[PDB]
Structures are given as structure tokens and as C-alpha cells.
């Protein structure tokens, strides 16, 4: 747990990072993106529930 805290201390993006690095550490990223393109969706469920939905009307 000391190590886990330390692991979070020396790496923690919230400044900016490549989307490639999040893809690299979690290939779950590419799995979900591919599954959504395959499914015929372009809505990411939950994205709109804590990020905007940028529309006026």
C-alpha cells in the first residue's frame, strides 16, 4: 500500500498525457473503442454523466 501510494505519486496525469499512454497501460481503452465502433455506437455511456454534452438547442 505504501508502494501503491508511491506509484500514484510518481505517475498521475491530470496535466495532460498522450491518449496513447492510457491505451498502452490499459489496452481496455482500445478494446472498448473497437467494440463501440463494431457495435455501431459513438456514445460513450457515462461520458455525458460527468462531462458535458455540448449543444445549445
Amino acid at each position: 500500500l505504501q508502494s501503491t501510494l508511491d506509484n500514484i505519486q510518481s505517475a498521475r496525469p491530470f496535466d495532460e498525457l498522450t491518449v496513447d499512454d492510457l491505451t498502452k497501460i490499459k489496452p481496455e481503452i482500445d478494446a472498448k473503442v473497437e467494440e463501440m465502433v463494431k457495435k455501431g455506437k459513438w456514445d460513450v455511456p457515462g461520458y455525458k454523466d460527468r462531462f458535458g454534452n455540448l449543444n445549445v438547442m
Binding site: 492510457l22 459513438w42 460513450v44
Partner: protein
Amino acid sequence: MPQLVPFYFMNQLTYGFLLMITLLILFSQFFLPMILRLYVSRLFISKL
């Protein structure tokens, strides 16, 4: 009126339809899934 008639119609339409098919594929395979990468990455951060 003849002013809205060029005879270059087929020239216009050829380059025109080439641009549409190009933009359609370009969005569909590349740039639309590249936005979906931002969204999905944001949601994974949301989970963690």
C-alpha cells in the same frame, strides 16, 4: 438562363464525388474513432 449552365458539369461532379467519399471514409475510420478514444479514456479515468 445559360449562366448557370457550364458544359463542365461532369468535370465538377467527378471531383465533387471524389471529395465526398474521401471525407466520409476519413471521418468514419480515422477521426470519429479518435474522438471516441478521448471519451473512453475520460470514462476510464472516471471509473478509476
